[PDB]
Write a protein that holds these residues in place. Structure first.
Motif, short mmCIF file in Angstrom:
data_model
loop_
_atom_site.label_atom_id
_atom_site.label_comp_id
_atom_site.label_asym_id
_atom_site.label_seq_id
_atom_site.Cartn_x
_atom_site.Cartn_y
_atom_site.Cartn_z
N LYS A 117 0.83 -1.20 0.00
CA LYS A 117 0.00 0.00 0.00
C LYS A 117 0.86 1.25 0.00
CE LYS A 117 -0.57 -0.08 5.04
NZ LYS A 117 0.23 1.15 5.27
N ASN A 118 1.97 1.23 0.75
CA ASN A 118 2.91 2.35 0.71
C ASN A 118 3.53 2.48 -0.68
OD1 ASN A 118 6.04 3.32 2.25
ND2 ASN A 118 4.26 4.58 1.70
N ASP A 119 3.82 1.36 -1.33
CA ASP A 119 4.32 1.43 -2.70
C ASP A 119 3.29 2.06 -3.62
OD1 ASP A 119 6.53 0.59 -4.60
OD2 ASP A 119 4.83 -0.44 -5.53
N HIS A 150 2.31 9.29 -5.90
CA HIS A 150 3.02 10.56 -5.80
C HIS A 150 3.91 10.78 -7.01
CE1 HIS A 150 5.18 13.93 -4.00
NE2 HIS A 150 6.31 13.31 -4.30
N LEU A 151 4.59 9.72 -7.46
CA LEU A 151 5.38 9.79 -8.68
C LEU A 151 4.50 10.11 -9.88
CD1 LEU A 151 7.52 6.61 -7.98
CD2 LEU A 151 8.22 8.99 -7.62
N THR A 152 3.32 9.48 -9.96
CA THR A 152 2.38 9.74 -11.05
C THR A 152 2.04 11.22 -11.11
OG1 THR A 152 0.41 9.39 -9.70
CG2 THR A 152 1.39 7.45 -10.74
N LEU A 188 3.93 13.55 -9.95
CA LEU A 188 5.16 14.12 -10.49
C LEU A 188 5.28 13.85 -11.98
CD1 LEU A 188 7.53 13.11 -7.56
CD2 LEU A 188 6.80 15.43 -8.12
N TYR A 189 4.88 12.65 -12.42
CA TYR A 189 4.92 12.33 -13.85
C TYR A 189 3.94 13.20 -14.64
CZ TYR A 189 7.35 8.16 -12.17
OH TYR A 189 8.23 7.30 -11.56
N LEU A 190 2.76 13.44 -14.08
CA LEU A 190 1.73 14.17 -14.81
C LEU A 190 2.17 15.60 -15.11
CD1 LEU A 190 -1.41 12.78 -12.99
CD2 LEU A 190 -0.94 12.60 -15.44
N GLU A 191 2.80 16.26 -14.14
CA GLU A 191 3.24 17.63 -14.35
C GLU A 191 4.40 17.73 -15.33
OE1 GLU A 191 5.97 19.69 -13.08
OE2 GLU A 191 7.23 18.00 -12.46
N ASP A 192 5.03 16.61 -15.66
CA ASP A 192 6.15 16.61 -16.60
C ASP A 192 5.66 16.82 -18.03
OD1 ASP A 192 7.88 16.11 -14.47
OD2 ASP A 192 7.69 13.94 -14.71
#
Ligand SMILES: Nc1ncnc2c1ncn2[C@@H]1O[C@H](COP(=O)(O)OP(=O)(O)O)[C@@H](O)[C@H]1O
Ligand SMILES: [Mg+2]
Lengths: 96, 193, 325, 198
Positions: D15-17, D23-25, D27-31
DNA sequence: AGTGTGTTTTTTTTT
DNA sequence: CACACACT
């Protein structure tokens, strides 16, 4: 000025000395005895005679040189054989 | 000196004379004094030669005045040198060559054993110092001369010096029951020479 | 004049010993044995020149082996930041330039040594288990017979190595190993410690009792308070009577001579489990150690003669440096 | 002698993963948290505030240190306690060290401790095994002496016996160091290779 | 107007 | 060897 010379010497005394030197290195506490050891004894005799300051080496001063070298050798041995070797060399030690 | 020479008991007085500030050690005193006197150099057929210098091997417990014995030895034989043992090396003691930028060529650097030559050689801390350096010392002492051929310098220097090595027993204490070679952490050939 | 009065009152007072010890150092370590060793090394001993060539070193060779966490590190900081012309060595790193003997080109020069900066001052090195043996050997010859020289090529000037020495070593793992005892807890070799007269040992323990008093002590010693001041003697005055103590040096009296030789025999008994009641740990080097320690005891009193009391106190210092195993 | 040791572990739950990967997603989306204001604010807080410890906080330090000795503890850790309390006084520009400053210092340090204290790999439980190691080595020496003639015998054979029965596979360097240590006390004699008895 | 004067890191080799 | 400077 002093340069003592071996003009007189005891050939066979040194001969029996090196003979006893032999069959002792067989001991585990005994290091090998070689010719350069004999030359060492000779130069110790020269050093003694220079210490005596006479321009001629003395036979008995050379004898004390023999005594010192053989005692050093005996000390080098293991104490177990050291006593047997000192008894064996006692025939040489008294002459000093 | 002549008058004392004809006096008997001179030898014992000399034995007492060497390092009086070290009480006892009668045999040690005898050895070091006779080393100071040194043997007579011998040469055969011009080329074959026998050293007139004495190489004293000493094994001593720590704090047994060995360095101080050496210090009394020096200043008594005039020409003298001191070998720290660990401080010197194969190049440093026997023969050294130094590149000289001011002259722009390789130049000889004073080998401390060359400084030993013509005089007594003091050796200390030798049982703890480098083994390759020990083999270099063996080589140098065997011929009473040091032969070096490197950096274009092929010179060979006579090394006539009565040397006295200072050593500590394995753990600082010699075991009489133990064989000397086992009491010695050094090579067999060196004790032979 | 007030200086002379301070000297008179302090030499006349009874507890001149350990009064200066409380004055010396932050004294945050309550043992104070390290601090009285510091006192004696301040007083030390004058180099001795015999009639023969064997000129006896006067500087006692002491260790204050302790933990880096313990107060010895702070005590050494106090000494270097206070004691005149003292050399500080961290211990973790050793550079031959900082050592007694070093080589610097241009013509030819010699890098400043610790003992030249010491000027008979103590070798205030720390973590001798952490200095390299390549740098230890610089002081091996140096602390032998007070002789700095280089076997390598160069001017190899005979720098005057007359200095007090303090290893202040930290054993393996930093903390003390009761198993490894005072001897062998560390890389520092037997010959170099053989020169080292006394060690004052190392002891490290959880010490639940000390967690009550000295744990409380640290905060007041170090914090907004930081006001645990214990200088029964001023710094300037401290140097002044250090000088005055060095002015006069005790000499063994015949009764003191017999007393000290008998006490050395007692030491020899104390060194049982050996031949001759071996000098061994308390060697002839350490016989010199007792002599100079008796000199340094009441050296602040500037008594010109050694007394049996000094010999007994030096014996106590020996014991506190012996029984620990 | 660190003030406040932290532990960063990359052990992530499923669940933490999921959460971290989301959170990365992002971060990925704003890229609100000014972030930039923090730098100038902290510079001015440094230029303004000089924390002062209170006697109540002083006694907090007292019993915290004695307890950390009980629950061993470092003087550097105590100076760290002081630094943490002063830093908390620095936060909020209260200019004065408080009791809760020391308490949060203690809680953070102890939370790092649980990861007793085990500072510098020092646990009061099973602190030292050198007693047992030395006794095991000595007992192996007596076993060899009973088995093999003479007090001194070759090191290779010692390496042979130590592994089979007395202990696990260990290098003879430790045994040689122990023998040298014993010789330094002259309770035993050291050789080198070979192990001779007194 | 006499007469003088200036320009073409690397790499083994220790160790 | 032979050409710009610094007085010669
Ligand atoms: N028989 C003795 N008489 C006088 N001093 C002695 C004697 N034996 C040892 N010493 C002293 O031992 C000290 C240590 O000498 P040194 O050779 O430096 O020791 P080490 O054995 O560690 O090399 C010297 O200061 C010397 O005076
Ligand atoms: Mg010495």
């Amino acid at each position: 000025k002093i340069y003592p010379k071996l003009h007189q010497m005891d050939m066979d005394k040194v001969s029996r000395v090196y003979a006893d030197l032999r069959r002792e290195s067989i001991s585990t506490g005994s290091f090998p005895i070689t010719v350069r050891h004999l030359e060492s004894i000779l130069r110790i005799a020269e050093s003694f005679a220079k210490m005596r300051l006479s321009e001629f080496v003395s036979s008995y001063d050379l004898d004390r040189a023999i005594k010192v070298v053989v005692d050093s050798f005996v000390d080098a041995q293991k104490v177990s054989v050291r006593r047997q070797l000192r008894r064996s060399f006692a025939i040489y030690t008294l002459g000093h | 000196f002549r008058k004392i020479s004809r006096d008997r008991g001179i030898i014992d007085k000399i034995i007492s004379s060497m390092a009086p500030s070290i009480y006892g050690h009668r045999d040690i005193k005898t050895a070091v004094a006779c080393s100071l006197f040194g043997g007579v150099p011998k040469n055969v057929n011009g080329k074959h030669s026998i050293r007139g210098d004495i190489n004293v091997l000493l094994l001593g417990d720590p704090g047994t005045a060995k360095s101080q014995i050496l210090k009394y030895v020096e200043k008594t034989a005039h020409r003298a040198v001191f070998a720290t043992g660990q401080g010197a090396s194969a190049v440093g003691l026997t023969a050294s060559v130094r590149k000289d930028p001011i002259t722009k060529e390789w130049t000889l650097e004073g080998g401390a054993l060359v400084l030993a030559d013509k005089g007594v050689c003091l050796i200390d801390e030798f049982d703890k110092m480098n083994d390759q350096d020990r083999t270099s010392i063996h080589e140098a002492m065997e011929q009473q001369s040091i032969s070096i051929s490197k950096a274009g310098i092929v010179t060979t220097l006579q090394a006539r010096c009565s040397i006295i090595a200072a050593a500590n027993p394995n753990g600082g204490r010699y075991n009489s029951t133990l064989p000397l070679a086992q009491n010695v952490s050094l090579t067999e050939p060196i004790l032979s020479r | 004049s007030d200086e002379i009065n301070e000297l008179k009152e302090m030499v006349k007072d009874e507890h001149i010993y350990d009064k200066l010890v409380r004055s010396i150092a932050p004294a945050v370590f309550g043992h104070e044995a390290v601090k009285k060793g510091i006192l004696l090394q301040m007083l030390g001993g004058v180099h001795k020149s015999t009639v023969e060539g064997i000129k006896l070193r006067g500087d006692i060779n002491i260790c204050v082996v302790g933990d880096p966490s313990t107060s010895k590190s702070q005590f050494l900081k106090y000494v270097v930041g206070f004691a005149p012309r003292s050399v500080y060595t961290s211990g973790k790193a050793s550079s031959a330039a900082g050592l007694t003997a070093a080589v610097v080109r241009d013509d030819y020069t010699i890098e400043a040594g610790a003992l030249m900066l010491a000027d008979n001052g103590i070798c205030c090195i720390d973590e001798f288990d952490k200095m390299d043996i390549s740098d230890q050997v610089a002081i091996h010859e140096a602390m032998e017979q007070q002789t700095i020289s280089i076997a390598k090529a160069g001017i190899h000037a005979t720098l005057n190595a007359r200095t007090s020495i303090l290893a202040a070593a930290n054993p393996v793992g930093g903390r003390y190993n009761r198993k490894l005892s005072l001897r062998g807890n560390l890389n520092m070799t037997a010959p170099i410690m053989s020169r080292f007269d006394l060690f004052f040992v190392i002891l490290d323990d959880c010490n639940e009792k000390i967690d009550t008093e000295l744990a409380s002590h640290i905060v007041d010693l170090h914090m907004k308070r930081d006001e645990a001041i214990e200088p029964p003697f001023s710094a300037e005055q401290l140097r002044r009577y250090i000088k005055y103590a060095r002015t006069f040096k005790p000499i063994l009296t015949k009764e003191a001579r017999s007393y000290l030789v008998e006490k050395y025999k007692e030491l020899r008994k104390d060194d049982a489990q050996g031949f001759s009641r071996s000098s061994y740990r308390i060697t002839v080097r350490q016989l010199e150690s007792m002599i100079r320690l008796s000199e340094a005891i009441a050296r602040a009193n500037c008594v010109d003669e050694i007394t049996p009391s000094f010999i007994a106190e030096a014996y106590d210092l020996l014991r506190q440096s012996i029984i620990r195993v | 002698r660190f003030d406040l040791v932290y532990l960063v572990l990359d052990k992530v739950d499923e669940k933490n993963d999921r959460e971290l990967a989301k959170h990365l997603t992002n971060l990925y989306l704003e890229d609100v948290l000014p972030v930039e204001f923090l730098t100038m604010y902290i510079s001015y807080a440094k230029e303004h505030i000089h924390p002062i410890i209170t006697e109540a906080a002083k006694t907090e330090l007292v019993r915290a240190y004695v307890g950390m000795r009980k629950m061993t503890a470092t003087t550097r850790q105590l100076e760290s306690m002081i630094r943490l309390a002063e830093a908390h006084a620095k936060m909020k520009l209260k200019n004065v060290v408080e009791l809760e400053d020391v308490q949060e210092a203690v809680r953070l340090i102890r939370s790092a401790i649980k990861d007793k204290i085990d500072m510098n790999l020092v646990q009061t439980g099973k602190s030292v095994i050198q007693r047992k190691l030395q006794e095991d080595l000595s007992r192996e020496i007596m076993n060899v002496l009973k088995d093999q003639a003479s007090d001194s015998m070759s090191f290779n054979e010692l390496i042979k016996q130590i592994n089979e029965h007395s202990q696990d596979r260990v290098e003879s360097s430790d045994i040689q160091e122990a023998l040298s240590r014993l010789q330094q006390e002259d309770k035993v004699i050291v050789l080198g290779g070979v192990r001779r008895s007194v």
